[PDB]
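Hi again,

Forgot to attach this to my earlier email, sorry! This is the prediction with manganese (II) ion bound. I've pasted everything inline since the attachment limit keeps bouncing my files.
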Amino acid sequence: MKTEDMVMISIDDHVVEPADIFEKHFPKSLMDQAPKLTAHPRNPRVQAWQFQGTVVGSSGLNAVVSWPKHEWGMDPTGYAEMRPAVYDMDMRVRDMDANGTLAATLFATFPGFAGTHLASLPDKKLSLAACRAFNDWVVGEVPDAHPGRFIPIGIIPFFDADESVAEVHRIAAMGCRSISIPETPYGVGEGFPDFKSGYWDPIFKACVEHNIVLSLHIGGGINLVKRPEGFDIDNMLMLTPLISTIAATDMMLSGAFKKFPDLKVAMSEGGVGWVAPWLDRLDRHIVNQSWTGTSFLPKGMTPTDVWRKNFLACYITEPSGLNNRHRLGVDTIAWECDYPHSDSTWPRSPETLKSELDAARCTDEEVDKITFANAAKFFDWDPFEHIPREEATVGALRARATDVDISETSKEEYRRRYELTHS
Amino acid sequence: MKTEDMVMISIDDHVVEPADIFEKHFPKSLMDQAPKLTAHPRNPRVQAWQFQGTVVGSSGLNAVVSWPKHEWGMDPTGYAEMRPAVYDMDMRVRDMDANGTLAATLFATFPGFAGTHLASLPDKKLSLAACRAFNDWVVGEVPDAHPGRFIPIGIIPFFDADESVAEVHRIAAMGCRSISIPETPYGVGEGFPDFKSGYWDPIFKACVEHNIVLSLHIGGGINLVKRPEGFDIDNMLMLTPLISTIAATDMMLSGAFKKFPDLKVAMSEGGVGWVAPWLDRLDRHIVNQSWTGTSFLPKGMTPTDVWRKNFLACYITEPSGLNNRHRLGVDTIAWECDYPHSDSTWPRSPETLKSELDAARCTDEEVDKITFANAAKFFDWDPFEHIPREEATVGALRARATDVDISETSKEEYRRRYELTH
Ligand SMILES: [Mg+2]
Ligand SMILES: [Mn+2]
Ligand SMILES: [Mn+2]
Ligand SMILES: [Mn+2]
Ligand SMILES: [Mn+2]
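Structure tokens for the complex follow:
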């Protein structure tokens, strides 16, 4: 197979919500309490969202596409500095065309990719309104404005189980395929109930009823880990995506799959390699403990069986990861772009992934599984409903974007263009 | 190769120090302050070590050898309940013969396998004395009494850098090949200095001068991870050996290999599979950050280069771990028995490992590397100085031990035998 004939669905990307999202979707009677854009306290030159006495904005590692690498950093950033495609979905699909990406899966910024910023705030009626307004935009408006380009994923008001169940039903009917939930809830704020407590069971139940995937995105497990005093960016960047073992262990040992055997879990941005040693240890534990007469799994299943039925490993780039694909089961590995994060392979995702696939001796069947078919089955999404397959390939989408400039562009030049646009 | 013809060195096992260790090795002038046996406050049926107003005993997951599985647990256990081989080194070598194990590497129980129990106590003169007495026993007496069966490994009084350097030099002269140090020092107690701070540099320097390996054994990383209030033994037991990524990242990014290019680090009981995804991310980071003109690594070296020269991955059983052996470099993977821990494969270590090696299509040369030759080279230890190779194989050692009973034996029966004896 040629690079140009790949079909690529990404099951993990990120969106910066545009400035009018709450003007358009917050309840009118609550509008004077809606999230509003203000200058960041540490950067009058960039805006951020003020909500319930808090201000939050985008990190400068999470919207870096096309920036020179020396401009990447932890400091807050904002619309003026960003390539417009990070916040303008009309421009986003053009960047996706240029990268050969058929579909993307948009994790939230302002509410938290798992909704934890809304869950941290004291007025839960206000936080609930903000959750529903966000879902109305990212689940309803965006996928319908760009049919076939976005896999609908939302968040829930997980501080309130009954309201979370209601929201699952509500966004299921809007086409929601996944909800992003905190991967290690006991690590969030003061702590929320863990998966073993039963607190999440009505949410798990409603998701199974709608075939909705739980996306457990990295970023929670790192907050569990004590570090030495001096903040080491490089150390954090190294550990943060390599410890999905914690949340996956929690979910496996919670008994969730014995109670809900059809429950689906995607370990978003977790990579591949962590799975193999973890399954080896779990598999051996179940064998060695079979004398107890019970386990956290449905009867007659090994951990590897449950991996293959209920889990999806998700990765951007990991050349050695595919050397255990037969251990895991090749059906359980899905690619992601992670646009516009520092870890994204944009705008060379096809070439970068194809080189790894070729070095791992992937067959064409395996290429298709990893680049789109595993994700499409797991998220119950038809990639060619709105865009025929011959028009959905890397080569065909790139042919629509020969005019898209993908060269390195300073955040200062985006700012100059932004200031010209808004005067 | 047949099972019987393997040669097996374990670079990670554990010892339960016997009752007379401090009677024999603690300074005579301080004997009234030595650790002394007493009833364990949480289990009066077993003894435990009292030292400086604390009492610590063995865990029932760390001396399980021959017990029925339903008897394994986190309750304290003691001499009376243990198979004698766990604390009696004359019986230990017979259990090693029965398992086909040529050599073992004995991590401590009472001081902490990295000495953190001694470091937690207020009187550091007594803690230093206990450290030196333990090293005298486990580095000096035990390997001398059983030549060729134990790779000498010690601990250090790491609460004091000057005393630690002095002790490295002292135990190096006794044949020490490794020191076990806390893998994540900032998580120990209220926190000790991390590897990046430079505090450990004179210790690293002394180790390199004697070609002594740093053993970073699992168990410290888990104490960094917040858990929910509701405890799940299984959750702890599942996570504890799978997060060696933390301490390895700390050591890699500390700059220690830039300052000490020959420093050697063994990730004891850490498994294998964590390495490949971690090296992929480190290799990528160093490529993508090369514009900075700085690195935590020596010039002209990638993270994979430093892995191959400076690290050893250590594992008991991991059927899928060898599927990235060429990624890592097959010279960097070493087997371990972890006797007498719950994770040990005793008394069928050869059979269990061989099945994994065959399934991974290992060549005879790769078999020899993983079972003994990588460890022997990494720890600069000659496996055939006292025992010729022909007499050192699984089959030859097991022929020494055909009379050794290895059947399941309840801890109540060991207690019956123990109490008759005493
Ligand atoms: Mg139904
Ligand atoms: Mn992501
Ligand atoms: Mn990311
Ligand atoms: Mn061990
Ligand atoms: Mn162990």
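The domain at 3-421 of chain B is CATH 3.20.20.140 (TIM Barrel). Chain B touches chain A through 54 residues (CB under 8 Å).

That should be everything now.

G.
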